[PDB]
């Protein structure tokens, strides 16, 4: 999957879309692998790739958010990115190492989620 | 598992009978020494290697004593008591297994044993065969699976009955070929 | 790569190379094409995920991908992103694109301006498909209300009346089965006094000539059914229920019904003050304020201490030895706050607890009799503390639901969660937000009441987990309410326990700040 | 003069004495053709008070809902003090049932006496007949399975095909539904005359209509669409088949093979297209009631 995505992006996005009609490989996380490898090799912009997390896969969301924070200088964009990631992460369980990273990024942006404080304190054991 | 003793003993008995080397009392004594009295496990597992040998051996022992084999002979205690009940709507799964995997073969091996002993001959074979093919199918019920082994077994016992009867013809085998063409009548390459 | 030419057959992959499989040049067109192909999926959850993806794109400045999506929508492209052998559901993709746009336009719709000419193509009465007209008009009016565009007054008057019954002064073997006919076509025909046999000939014309199918009704006309992609009866339905997976005959009948309905408004008067809207809203999203159910979901509340500490206890006694302690947690989640209404369950690997709470108002002198009267009983299921003198106070959750019940991100919630009856809101001058989450007094800074709901949408062959809903209020508010309605408060709690592989009490609250039971009194 | 009064008295006694005549009168009033043989047998079996824990199984489209409505309206026509509970799959169905009950009450002449008195509580969810006293529980209550079951006691309980693909597709759904069905028995009043009835059609391999029989001790009767299709299919039910069908099939067992049980409504060519709409498994599940 990674070599095919790296060799020609526009062809790979069509091919993996036809595979899902054929149900070839529906037990694997193909889309996450393809998108993250294209982000790493600088062939697609991170702000284009971030909204795809609404499709349920084994994403590494903090790596995508870090790629967004390291790339764009506009103060609006990182605020919006944090909002989107936080909302579509909120409802299912997480370990403390994720929550503390999100808290630190929130302190850097200049927002103080008491909700995040309480939800991380409730697991501090 | 796959203790080969029953098949070897049965083959020896068949060979001794067909050459008129031994008496029937000797055969009864020898089969009685080896057949278990309680029914063995393999009668209700469709992939146990032993099943066909036991079915053949019990049918031959039954026909040597002038009987005909029935389902109640192979049955264990619980299902025998079930077959002595009357007011039943139910039917246990370990009974349907014995009907599905062993029951359909009882009409065939009785005719096979009758031909072996010389009690049924070429001059009236077809009336038996056309009856037997009915009598099996009434027991058969719903073969909803395409993976049934029973067609492959029935073809073998049918061909053996023809070859043992004598003076076969091309059309007789072509009947087996024609029967194989319907759905579910699968015959494997060996 | 040519070492494989002696074993590659046809029907390996898509088949031999043909130029119609060529991908687009820019990457963003391919990403837009992936999302476009997922909008047309036969499974509902994927369509809702793609709708959320489009909504997430429009809340950013992501111009190129959005313009790519609308370009694919205009051209109705199928093949480079779809299998050559399986049919594609175009109209589902267009309908869910309208559903996404209608929600984008409510908050900040500016991103929709450069493609405005798309919506004008569908918001006219010479387009016979009812729902697509409906959502296109809802998008245009929402942009008009936000002062992003300006619409002339007669055009506004036409758009606001798009499905009015204006025309008041005025062989094939295909069959509609044992469930689609009687439960889907008959209620439509009942609006005009027409039986479904009289309206089948228009449906057959629409199927054979517009949608273009020309086969028979047999179950093996669908390739996905022949190859056994559907499993465990996902595509079965009955008594007007929706399926989980849309098979091909259902797709055809579903769109043919809405194209049939558009002709009857143009030719025939209806029979009774408007019956058509009450039919149409059966096939719409669940909320009257055009928001989604996904906006109502909250995270689970913090756990009760007795649950954590009692998790270690041995099981058989735990099913039989409910302490009094748990009830003190149920009435008071946190200091200064009381539970007014609620019903929920808490789940672990071996055990589950169920909790129910009720509250009502009773005349001050008669309350002292009613406290003894309710507890002296043979049974507690044969009578009920009521809801909107013993008098009701709160109205309970609604039962009805819309088509967004299959959205994975809405955890099977229902929107009208409990709230006070109208006269309490009027007399106490309360105000609230757009989702009725928090209520404020006209005189204090702290909230009067807080409501919440939580849960998950269950998949196949999976465990249950914790869910429920709750309403809570501050003590100051209920004291003021009791001093101005001049009443005493009676409330009741059930706790029950079950295994995985009831104890009932009542409390009476009085405005001097005291709680009374048959057995004892408690204070702050 | 007197002859018509004698006719009126005899007819109004007879209709309270015979369910089948009441069905004929009602179906003439609805302008529907005469009830078929299976419908008569189903109504007659339902009317007998000796079945206390009872399940009836029948193929799709036979007429279960109309029979249920005529039953409950006839029952309250004979005794207006009874408490009746109607449980259905969903809100839409419960509303349709209650509306149809009101339509039957208004359609026939004499049943107009059952119209409620001031203080009506003439709601769509629950209501009283006029001859009932002011009382805690209502005469008729109609509810969906997810709705408000709690808060009353019932004398007669009717279940109108609760198990549905829309509510039994997941493990959680089946477990919830199993809890609700196995909780109804506490609602029933403990007088000797109380009774509960299920009507429905199995939808899956697991069906609660079998669970209630194998453990809880209920009794069931079955009407298949056509006479048994082979010997082994016939061997599936001997105690379960309706007495008319078994009584015929013991005798003409070769000519009756596969013949339709109700040719007045369902000919062979009308059953064949059902076997084209659905696979042979689906047809056997829904019309022969033999889950494989
Ligand atoms: N003898 C008859 N002749 C003609 N039409 C009839 C007859 N009996 C009933 N019907 C009509 O056919 C339908 C059968 O009733 P109904 O749909 O309630 O059956 P059902 O058993 O509840 O159905 P299902 O299994 O689909 O839920 C009704 O519309 C009824 O008016
Ligand atoms: Mg019905």
3-state secondary structure chain B: CCCCHHHHHHHHHHHHHHCCCCCHHHHHHHHHHHCCCCCCHHHHCCCCCCHHHHHHHHHHHHHHCCCCCCHHHHCCHHHHHHCCCCCCCCCCHHHHHHHHHCHHHHHHHHHHHHHHCCCCCHHHHHHHHHHHHHHHHHHHCCCCCCCCCHHHHHHHHHHHHHHHHCCCCHHHHHHHHHHCCCCCCCCCCC
* Residue of D91, D135, D172 to mutate, interface with C, max C Cβ within 10 Å: D172
Ligand 2 centre and the CA of D187: distance in Å? 25
Chain B partners (3+ C-beta pairs within 8 A): D
Strands (E), C365-408: 390-391, 394-395
Kindly state the DSSP code that residue C515 receives in the 8-state scheme: E
Q: Do C262 and C208 contact (CB within 8 A), yes or no?
A: no
- A48:C28 CB<8 A: yes
Rounded to whole angstroms, how far apart are CA atoms D187 and C211? 53
Question: Tokens standing for A107?
Answer: 């302190």
Burial, D230: exposed, middle or buried (Cβ in 10 Å; 0-12, 13-18, 19+)? Answer: middle
Question: Longest Cα pair distance anywhere in chain D, in angstroms?
Answer: 68
Q: Match 């006293």 to its residue by tokens.
A: D133
**Contact criterion met (CB < 8 Å) for A51 and C409:** no
Q: Which two tokens stand for residue C45?
A: 């959850």
Measured between alpha carbons, how far apart are the two ends of chain C, in Å? 81
* Ligand nearest to the CA of residue D40, numbered in listed order: 1
- How far apart are the CA of C239 and the centre of ligand 2, in A? 8
Q: How was this structure determined?
A: cryo-EM
DSSP state, residue C116 = G
**Sequence-separated (6 or more) residues with CB below 8 Å from residue D212:** D55, D181, D198, D218
Beta bridge partners of C346: C353
Nearest to C488 by CA among C361, C392, C374: C361
The tokens describing B10, both together, are: 């049965």
Query: Which residues, other chains included, contact B106 with Cβ-Cβ below 8 Å and sequence gap of 6+?
Result: B55, B59, B69, B70, B71, B139
C416's CB contacts (< 8 A; 6+ apart) are C397, C398
Residues on chain B touching D291 (C-beta within 8 angstroms): none
What the block records as the tokens of C403 is 């088509």
Q: What is the DSSP letter of C245?
A: B
Taking the CA of residue B141 and the nearest CA in chain D, the distance in Å comes to: 5
Per the structure block, which two tokens stand in for B188? 């494997």
Burial of D19 (0-12, 13-18, 19+ CB in 10 A): buried
Pairwise CA distance, residues C429 & C477, whole Å:
12
Torsions phi, psi for A23 (to 5 deg)? 60, 25
Strand partners, C357: C342, C493
**Residue C504 pairs with which residues in a beta bridge?**
C494
Count Cβ atoms below 10 Å from residue C351 Cβ, excluding itself: 18
Task: Please check whether residue C62 is in contact with residue A69, taking contact to mean a CB–CB distance below 8 angstroms.
Answer: no
The angle at the Cα of D282, spanning D277 to D284, to the nearest 5 degrees, equals 115
Q: How far apart are CA D60 and CA D64, in angstroms?
A: 9
Q: Which residues pair with C22 in a beta bridge?
A: none
- Which chain A residues touch C298 with a CB distance below 8 Å? none
- For β-strands D156-160 and D126-127, DSSP reports them as unpaired
Measured in angstroms, how far is the CA atom of residue D221 from the centroid of ligand 2?
18
C386 touches D: beta carbon within 8 Å: no
- Please check whether residue C30 touches A, CB under 8 A: yes
Interatomic CA distance for residues C253 and C207, integer angstroms? 8
Which residues of D are part of a known binding site? Answer: 39, 60-61, 63-65, 265
- Confirm if D249 and D234 have CB atoms less than 8 A apart: yes
Vertex A98: Cα angle to A92 and A103 (nearest 5):
105
Cβ-Cβ contacts under 8 Å, A78 against chain C:
none
The chains found to touch A (3+ Cβ pairs under 8 angstroms) are C
The CA distance from B34 to C7, in Å, is 54
Q: Which two tokens stand for residue C319?
A: 């099913």
What's the rounded Cα separation, in Å, for the pair D35 and D70?
Answer: 13
On the CB side of D288, CA atoms within 13 Å amount to 22
Q: Is A117 on the interface with C (CB under 8 A)?
A: no
Number of C-beta neighbours around residue C471 at 10 A = 22
Given A23, A52, A115, which is nearest C53 (Cβ)?
Answer: A52
Ligand 1, atom 3: closest residue by C-alpha: D33
Tell if the CB–CB gap between A84 and C56 is shorter than 8 Å. yes
C interface mutation test: which of A8, A9, A13 has the most C CBs within 10 A? A13
Determine the 3-state secondary structure of D188 from DSSP. strand
Instruction: Take atom 8 of ligand 1 and give the residue whose Cα is closest.
Output: D63
Chain A residues touching C453 at Cβ < 8 A: none
Rounded distance between C-alpha atoms, residue A113 and residue A100, angstroms: 12
CA distance A115 to chain C (A): 10
List, edge to edge, every strand of the sheet that includes D84-88.
D126-127, D140-144, D84-88, D156-160, D195-200, D53-58, D219-223
Reading phi first (left if > 0) and then psi (alpha if -120 to 50, else beta), residue C473 is in beta
In terms of Cα–Cα distance, which of B150, B149, B152 is closest to B136?
Answer: B150
User: Which position has the token pair 């919506």?
Assistant: C119
Vertex D128: Cα angle to C361 and C388 (nearest 5): 20
Closest CA to B62 of B11, B99, B16, B113: B113
Question: What's the DSSP call for residue C112?
Answer: G
C53 and A55 in contact by Cβ < 8 A? yes
User: Residue C399 and residue D91: Cβ atoms within 8 Å?
Assistant: yes
Distance CA D226, CA D268 (A): 9
Question: Nearest Cα to C139, choosing from C151, C129, C127?
Answer: C151
Ligand 2 mean position, distance from CA C240 (Å):
11
Answer whether D31 touches C (CB < 8 Å). no
Q: Does C39 touch chain A (CB under 8 A)?
A: no
**Cα-based angle D119, D121, D126 (whole degrees, multiple of 5):** 155
Distances (CA, A) of C159 to C105, C135, C147, C148, C282: 16, 11, 17, 17, 21
Phi and psi angles of residue C162, each rounded to the nearest 5 degrees, phi first: -65, -30
CA D87, CA A85: separation in Å to the nearest integer? 45
Disruptive mutation site among C220, C456, C464 for chain D (greatest number of D CBs within 10 Å): C464
Residue C523 backbone dihedrals phi, psi, to 5 degrees: -140, 165
State how far Cα D9 lies from the chain centre.
30
CA-closest residue to ligand 1 atom 1? D35
Nearest to B114 by CA among B64, B163, B153, B53: B64
């Amino acid at each position: 999957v990674e070599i095919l995505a790296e060799l020609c992006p526009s062809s790979a996005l069509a091919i993996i879309s036809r595979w899902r009609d054929r149900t070839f490989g529906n037990h694997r996380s193909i889309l996450a692998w393809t998108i993250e490898h294209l982000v790493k090799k600088n062939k697609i912009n991170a702000l284009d790739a971030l909204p795809l997390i609404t499709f349920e896969n084994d994403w590494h969301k903090c790596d995508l958010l870090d790629s967004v924070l390291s790339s764009c200088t506009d103060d609006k964009d990182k605020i919006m990115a944090f909002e989107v990631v936080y909302h579509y992460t909120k409802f299912n369980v997480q370990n403390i190492q994720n929550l503390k990273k999100l808290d630190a990024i929130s302190t850097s942006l200049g927002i103080e989620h008491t909700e995040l404080k309480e939800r991380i304190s409730g697991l501090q054991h | 598992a796959n203790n080969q003793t029953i098949a070897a003993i049965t083959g020896m008995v068949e060979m001794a009978l067909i050459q008129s080397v031994c008496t029937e009392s000797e055969s009864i004594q020898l089969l009685d020494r080896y057949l278990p009295k309680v029914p063995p496990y393999a009668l209700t597992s469709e992939y146990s290697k032993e099943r066909v040998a036991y079915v053949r051996a019990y049918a031959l022992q039954a026909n040597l004593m002038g009987s005909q084999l029935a389902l109640s002979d192979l049955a264990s205690t619980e299902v025998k008591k079930e077959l002595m009940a009357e007011k039943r709507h139910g039917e246990s799964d370990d009974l349907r297994q014995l009907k599905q995997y062993s029951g359909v073969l009882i009409p065939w091996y009785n005719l096979w044993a009758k031909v072996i002993l010389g009690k049924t001959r070429k001059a009236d074979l077809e009336s038996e065969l056309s009856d037997t093919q009915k009598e099996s199918t009434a027991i058969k019920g719903h073969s909803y699976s395409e993976h049934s082994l029973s067609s492959n077994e029935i073809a073998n016992v049918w061909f053996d009955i023809l070859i043992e009867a004598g003076n076969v013809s091309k059309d007789d085998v072509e009947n087996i070929i024609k029967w194989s063409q319907h759905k579910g009548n699968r015959v494997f390459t060996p | 790569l040519d070492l494989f030419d002696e074993v590659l057959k046809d029907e390996d992959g898509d088949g031999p190379w043909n130029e119609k499989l060529s991908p687009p040049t820019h990457v963003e067109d391919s990403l837009a094409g992936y999302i476009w192909a997922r909008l047309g999926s036969p499974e509902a959850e994927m369509r809702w995920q793609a709708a959320h993806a489009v909504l997430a794109l429009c809340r950013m400045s992501r111009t190129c991908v959005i313009q790519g999506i609308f370009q694919h929508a205009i051209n109705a492209t199928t093949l480079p992103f779809c299998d050559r052998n399986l049919p594609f559901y175009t109209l589902h993709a267009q309908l869910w694109l309208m559903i996404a746009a209608a929600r984008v336009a409510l908050d900040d719709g500016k991103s929709l301006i450069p493609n405005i000419g798309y919506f004008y193509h569908y918001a006219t009465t010479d387009q016979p498909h009812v729902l697509i007209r409906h959502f296109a008009a809802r998008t245009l009016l929402a942009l008009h209300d936000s002062d992003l565009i300006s619409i002339p007054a007669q055009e506004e008057n036409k758009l606001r009346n798009i499905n009015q019954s204006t025309t008041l002064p005025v062989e094939d073997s295909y069959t509609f089965g044992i469930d689609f006919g009687p439960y889907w076509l008959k209620p439509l025909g009942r609006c005009f006094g027409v039986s479904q046999k009289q309206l089948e000939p228009e449906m057959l014309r629409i199927i054979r000539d517009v949608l273009g199918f020309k086969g028979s009704r047999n179950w093996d006309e669908d390739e996905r059914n022949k190859r056994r992609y559907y499993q465990d009866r996902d595509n079965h339905h009955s008594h007007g229920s929706y399926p989980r997976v849309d098979d091909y005959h259902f797709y055809l009948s579903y769109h043919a019904m809405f194209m049939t309905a558009g002709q009857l408004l143009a030719t025939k008067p209806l029979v009774g003050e408007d019956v058509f809207q009450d039919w149409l809203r059966r096939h719409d999203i669940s909320r009257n304020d055009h928001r989604w159910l996904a906006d109502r979901r909250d995270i689970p509340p913090k756990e009760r201490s007795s649950w954590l500490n009692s998790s270690s206890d041995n099981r058989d006694e735990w099913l039989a030895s409910i302490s009094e302690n748990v009830f003190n947690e149920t009435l008071c989640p946190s200091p200064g706050l009381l539970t007014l209404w609620g019903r929920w369950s808490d789940v672990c690997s071996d055990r589950k607890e169920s909790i129910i709470v009720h509250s009502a108002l009773v005349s001050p002198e008669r309350s002292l009799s009613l406290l003894r009267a309710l507890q002296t009983t043979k049974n507690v299921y044969d009578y009920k503390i009521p809801d909107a003198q013993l008098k009701g106070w709160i109205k309970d959750i609604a039962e009805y639901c819309g088509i967004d019940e299959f959205d994975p991100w809405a955890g099977n919630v229902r929107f009208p969660i409990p709230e006070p009856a109208s006269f309490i809101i009027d007399a106490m001058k309360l105000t609230t937000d757009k989702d009725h989450r928090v209520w404020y007094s006209p005189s204090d800074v702290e909230p009067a009441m807080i409501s919440s709901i939580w849960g998950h949408l269950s998949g196949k062959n999976d465990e249950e987990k914790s869910h429920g809903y709750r309403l809570c209020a501050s003590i100051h508010f209920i004291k003021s309410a009791l001093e101005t309605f001049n009443m005493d408060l009676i409330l009741e709690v059930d706790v029950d326990r079950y295994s995985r592989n009831s104890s009932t009490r009542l409390f009476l609250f009085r405005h001097d700040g005291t709680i009374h039971t048959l057995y004892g009194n408690y204070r702050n | 003069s007197q002859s018509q009064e004698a006719k009126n008295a005899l007819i109004i006694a007879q209709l309270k004495g015979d369910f089948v005549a009441f069905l004929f009168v009602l179906w003439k009033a609805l302008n529907l053709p005469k009830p078929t043989k299976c419908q008569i047998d189903m109504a007659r079996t339902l009317a007998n008070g000796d079945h206390k824990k009872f399940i009836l199984q029948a193929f799709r489209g036979i007429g279960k809902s109309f029979i249920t409505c005529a039953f409950v309206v006839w029952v309250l026509w004979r005794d207006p003090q009874l408490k009746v509970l109607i449980v259905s799959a969903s809100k839409e169905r419960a509303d349709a049932n209650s509306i149809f009950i009101k339509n039957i009450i208004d359609l026939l002449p004499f049943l107009s006496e059952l119209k409620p008195r001031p203080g009506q509580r003439d709601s769509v969810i629950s209501f009283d007949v006029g001859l009932a006293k002011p009382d805690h529980s209502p005469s008729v209550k109609s509810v969906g399975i997810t709705g408000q079951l709690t808060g009353s006691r019932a004398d007669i309980i009717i279940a109108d095909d609760v198990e549905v693909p829309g509510n039994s597709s997941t493990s959680s759904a089946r477990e919830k539904l199993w809890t609700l069905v196995t909780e109804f028995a506490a609602l029933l009043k403990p007088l000797p005359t109380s009774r509960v009835i299920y009507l429905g059609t199995p939808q899956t391999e697991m069906t609660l209509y079998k669970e209630l029989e194998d453990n809880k001790g209920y009794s069931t009767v079955i009407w298949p669409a056509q006479y048994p299709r082979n010997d082994a299919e016939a061997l599936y039910y001997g105690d379960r088949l309706a007495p008319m069908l078994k009584a015929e099939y013991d005798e003409g067992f070769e000519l009756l093979r596969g013949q339709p049980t109700d040719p007045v409504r369902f000919d062979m060519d009308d059953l064949r297209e059902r076997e084209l709409e659905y696979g042979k498994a689906g047809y056997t599940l829904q019309f022969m009631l033999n889950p494989n």
